[PDB]
Symmetry: D2
Subunit: 479 residues, 4 copies
């Protein structure tokens, strides 16, 4: 419900991230009438392009119906492109002049989407700060990963940026925080009683945060290798999920009241020991099809003799009254058997058994994807003419209960949040700090010693050794 004019600046428009995620995503929001009326889109890159060009290369990506022709015409009518250089100050001054010329560009709120490489980040933020900033309206910078590789590399940038911009201006992206069920963890936990008395070490045996992809690095091992999986999905995604699951109740649903509690949790976490860790690497599958018979080292982009993991099983620990002793198992990997992002709370066994070991540990499962759902695995009396216990479940499936309700992409809701000034779902400075504090030591070690990752066949569940790190830590599987 805004009247303020808006400028959405996509830095690196000729890019692939902007051309296939950012542009299309902002189209979806323009179409669905989710953006303020007076909103302009400006793309900025070296390549000397026209709005005819940006459209030609992006439209194949808008998933547009011929009934939207008019809305498309209207969207691009509000689009412009400014060719400029990334480390040049005059190019940036032009960008600014262009914006001021836009209708009310002077008082408009500027939203800068950094769709560039991190190698560029500093130059761009330093340059935007000087030239490209509004003085009447607010200015906000949308950032993304990676936010460094080391704790030193990140604090290096965190501080550079933190010196020109405030935190109420920085919006760092962890798209998982834009995911429906991930976002649901808060209401589920804090709006429900049935899930309160049980949310502790007293009742929970262990917690599992799972990341699974059926495919692996796809002829793109080059970029990956310098990254590993931990730095790729663990330090960010998996960890964020953990927070929302372990954090205490905030004073409010307020942006920075919530974030404090997330940091509070990361601070109760001691460092990952290389004894509770289990790395793996994907070798090919001789009995498969296509890319499936190709290992990771079977990639030319892939350095010759890599100790880089494409699978990691890790046990973290939240040292406080609520979780003191409860193992948090973060199991992430590519080249696995399926696509799954989920949170799982395996509850302890019941005291005093009158059912003769017939019962199986209860479980709360939040399936981020696919098939959005929150279900409770428990025991029921075997239906019919039987008296024994049986494993059953109470479910909430978005597919049946909420058949005809579209769940938005993380970007749509996350971009929309930057338009609203809602940082609650964006990573905060101190958060990154703590995330690096935990993994940095381990990630370093993996570099000095360069351990040999356990191999696993493409389409497998990963290295068996991880499963044992699980049972050893307190996980029971039968069911």
């Amino acid at each position: 419900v805004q009247s303020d004019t808006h400028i959405f600046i996509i830095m690196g428009a000729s890019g692939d991230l902007a051309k296939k995620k950012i542009y299309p995503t902002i189209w979806w929001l323009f179409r669905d009438g989710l953006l303020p009326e007076n909103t302009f889109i400006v793309g900025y890159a070296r390549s000397r392009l026209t709005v005819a060009d940006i459209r030609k290369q992006s439209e194949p990506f808008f998933k547009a119906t011929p009934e939207e022709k008019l809305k498309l015409e209207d969207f691009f009518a509000r689009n412009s492109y400014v060719a400029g250089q990334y480390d040049d100050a005059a190019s940036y001054q032009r960008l600014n002049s262009h914006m001021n010329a836009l209708h009310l560009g002077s008082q408009a709120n500027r939203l800068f989407y950094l769709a560039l490489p991190p190698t560029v980040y500093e130059a761009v933020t330093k340059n935007i700060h000087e030239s490209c900033m509004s003085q009447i309206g607010w200015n906000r910078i949308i950032v993304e990963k990676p936010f460094g590789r080391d704790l030193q590399s990140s604090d290096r940038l965190s501080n550079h940026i933190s010196s020109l911009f405030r935190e109420d201006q920085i919006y760092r992206i962890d798209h998982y925080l834009g995911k429906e069920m991930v976002q649901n963890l808060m209401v589920l936990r804090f709006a429900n009683r049935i899930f309160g008395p049980i949310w502790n070490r007293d009742n929970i045996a262990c917690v599992i945060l799972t990341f699974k992809e059926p495919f692996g690095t796809e002829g793109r091992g080059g970029y990956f290798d310098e990254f590993g999986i931990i730095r790729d999905v663990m330090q960010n995604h998996l960890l964020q999920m953990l927070c929302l699951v372990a954090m205490e109740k905030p004073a409010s649903t307020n942006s920075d009241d919530v974030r404090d509690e997330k940091v509070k949790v990361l601070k109760c976490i001691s460092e990952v020991q290389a004894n509770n860790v289990v790395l793996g690497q994907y070798v090919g599958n001789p009995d498969g099809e296509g890319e499936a018979t190709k290992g990771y080292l079977d990639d030319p982009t892939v350095p010759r003799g890599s100790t880089t993991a494409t699978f990691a099983a890790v046990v973290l620990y939240v040292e406080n009254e609520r979780w003191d002793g409860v193992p948090f198992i973060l199991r992430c990997g590519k080249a696995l058997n399926e696509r799954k992002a989920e949170v799982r709370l395996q509850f302890h066994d019941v005291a005093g058994d009158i059912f003769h070991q017939q019962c199986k540990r209860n479980e709360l499962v939040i399936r981020v994807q696919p098939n959005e759902a929150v279900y409770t695995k428990m025991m029921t009396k075997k239906p019919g003419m039987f008296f024994n216990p049986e494993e059953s479940e109470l479910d909430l499936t978005y597919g049946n209960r909420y058949k005809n309700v579209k769940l938005p992409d993380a970007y749509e809701r996350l971009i929309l949040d930057v338009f609203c000034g809602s940082q609650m779902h964006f990573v905060r400075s101190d958060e990154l700090r703590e995330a690096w504090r935990i993994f940095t030591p381990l990630l370093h070690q993996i570099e000095l010693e360069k351990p040999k990752p356990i191999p696993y066949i493409y389409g497998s569940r990963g290295p068996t050794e991880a499963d044992e790190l699980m049972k050893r830590v307190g996980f029971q599987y039968e069911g």
Copy 2:
């Protein structure tokens, strides 16, 4: 055993319950092959008849298909009759010899199902103990309601019967104890941790035990006018469900280990008080359907100026560490807006609301019928581009999950139990005693003071004063 010869004596075989429930039930158990091979069905009554007549008057209750014309012959081929009076030892010595004439009759196991009026209960048990008893096998007597009009009344009956038979011989019936969801209560709470720590005064705001029928006294309100709704459905059915919901975890799934926990709960339920009771008597709905246009008094089988309650709402309190203070609402009525039998726990509101009053109390619901299911009404984030909390639920509906499966009749399963020697789901002497100690003082006040029940329209929900009573004690209703 499952090789042993059994005789199933149906006393009052010409009756309507015999010919409409017992006979048709015993045959299904037969057809579905649940009864033991060597079982014989002997009917005993006055009306001198032939197994041929019996077939004709009960056969339109068999729910049988043409495909099973022979099994019925197989069935009726194990049937017999023995005409006699209920207090003539000549007739009984006849019933005996008859069974003694059956193959291994003298060595068999005997099941006396009593399908007679409670006036004959006295005489029959005697003569059964006097003549028709086994010396080689077991003897069990199935007694059905009603078990007396008052604590003193029931004491008379119970004492007589127990003067002749032991408790492992007495099978008191309450079919609700043979209903699927009702039996599932035990396993639901004691087999799961997810439901353990919320099951107490600290988390539960109140418990509501509901019983409703869309119909009324179908042309026969002269029988009921003697008993009333409380005696009819509350003292027995509703009270049993409260026992299962309220009881402590037993030492084992054993009969008198479970039945002990049941009686123990009743023992700490103080007597009901009229200032915690709402009585209703239905009237007709002129803008009505058919049978609805007629209320209780619009039946001549029903005496004049009757003040008999066709609806009751009673608040009970279980005084103990677990339930001290939690109200147990017992709402039972006839001629309402629906046919439902369910257990429902309304939990307290979460402490420290961060969601601005938008939050509704959680609820565990166990619908005994219809559509057998157990679900938890909870709060989830409004799905889509919304952050506010919305009411949803996690369900375990049997119709979907267990489409295939066949949920048996309460009598099919209950009767089958008398065969295995399971008293779990049969009312004990003490239990029955405790249940009368609770309701008598009030039942008496109603016969003495003779208050005028609040009228309520046929199809309605009953007197609003019932809803008011619910509020006053803690019940929080949506709207």
Copy 3:
């Protein structure tokens, strides 16, 4: 406050238990005006004595002040002695005639104190039942240990007695149940909130029931040897304490409502494994004085080459929701360093430590004796100009708070209880059963294998090995 005439029959009056415990104890109650007015005392034994004789040998034991001369004269005026035989029926008939002659002896309530050997028990109960029983007043039998040695030996007597007498007539003695603080466990636990939320496996690390005597078998090893310490103090005393500490809350403080819960607890206890057990035997102390330099085998009454324990450390386990997993450590012994009977609850460590391991496990201590007290060991800020934590305590000492209040001997209150018809502090049949069920297997084993008990110097704390059975089981000592 009774008018009923009373007869207190001391069977085995010339005995030492009657002459030094029973007689004097009943004198204390007569004096303090605790007995009914019309109360007669009859002593029964083979020895042909007069009330002049019984007095001469007992008075040295009454701890009487010359100001009680008159009360003494009055006490013995109400005393009589009947010489008779233990297995003769005429001797018993005389006893009866004597009682009927006492003023209103016919309608008087008879209380039979079995101050005899167990070798006699049966003969006496069988004989009393026939002759010596009132028909107008109640009759009660006061029994004592041992109640058998095996579960079979006890069930043997339990049943003999149980066949002539009801349980509401049997009063079995465990003098520890007559001890102030032991009796206090109920109020402490069930009348206080501060001791509720903490009384569970969630908070309690372990429980310790301690029995200690500074002296050992005193030239009386003969009687002891056939007994051991387990059968002597563990199966009874220590176990009873455990019950009162582990039992759930009863429906009332009622005699048999309380006892049910005690049995309930013993039934959740699985058998003592010889792996969690630690026996010991006391060798002498070459650097001591008097009996202190004498071992146990240094007793001639002591069989030549004994494997009999005078010290036992045992870990029991209550398998239920409250104590599931919490080790119950029963540590009993003679020839130890001190006299102590106490209950101790060591609580778990606090989660999330901001004090740097400066804190010591909390502890609830109930000291049965000496120095009656219930105190709470916890942490305080070091008093004065310090900020660190320090171990301190909150105490309730009967010596200061209740300076001038006499705490009675177990016998006075326990005997008085038999006069009131209060069985709550007397062992019940089913209880003995369960106690034997646990230890019988272990006690047997110790007989077949005849293991060599670890030796320990008179005045020691016992075998070090027990201390480790402690830490291993979860006990921390520093403080």
Copy 4:
């Protein structure tokens, strides 16, 4: 450090607080050898004086003994004076050079203790920042109350001061935070398990924070008439204790980790409401003692028709998971029946009473003064031959347990802290802000509406309406 040179500048040295509290305090710290070796005491004021005068007017407050006539010389040998005005930069440039003349003055650590009126607070901080500041060592400013009359008033002061100094430089004082038992709160709850799980809404019925003085406005009610009881003792003292009792367990015993938890609790305390407040103003007791015969208005220093409250009772609510619903009673008054400062938690009644209403609510009491102690009022079995429950208590009285030990003054310890650099026990900006946000709305209503305080006799307990208010909210009182 403990080798570093320090200067202790006492601004307003001729004042009564200086000469009566600060000087005598600083010397004890000196004599007891707590101050660092190289410490200098520089007095600054108007009245042109000599260290000689200062000695004579403060020396009768030294609590000194003849045995220490020399230490005082050692003390006064480190004393200096600097006459000047409070808003003349000439006088200040004098104060400086003076310290610069002291040994290592230019390199020293500086402590500006402000013993002046709040009118001068503004000017002084300025000039201290303008001239009298160090460049080599640390500068800390000790500000005492009052910190403004309203939220707006305090915002003015806080903002000025913070415009010059940082928070690690500002030391706001509340001596109650330097009292033994008050400081022990932290360790009492967070260092023990015995007090952890009962510390919540589930177990606590209510919290009562008490402050009383047996005396009144001793001849000086013109100063107080401007402020009132709430501003005087509740907003500060009482509120701080509630913070410590109510706060969540901090991440560490660190200043702004603890101070964070304090502010967090205040942040969820809604503003007070008049319908939850009782105001009293004392009158004289004719059957009186001496000074008692005179009430507030019977003093001419006190304006006429004054409606200033000399007693207040306020109910607050901390809206959160832990305390939601629990009432925090703030009872503070002058001219009562005693001098007491204590924290008290009244627990709920146990569920399922098996002791027949004889049971009283348990209570954890922490008496700050007098007779520093912490005890728990509980129920124990009436000692002796009784079975009924009686009220007793487990105590930790410092007078007995720590006879020997010396509990220091709040200022002795507090001041010593400014020396170590500990702000734990010093009020932060936000805290102070939150504390005014809570009481302002009401303070204003009192100045606007000007209600007439309920009179109460000198020596009494205050208005009964206060006791009534306590009841209504849950307070259960014996009798």
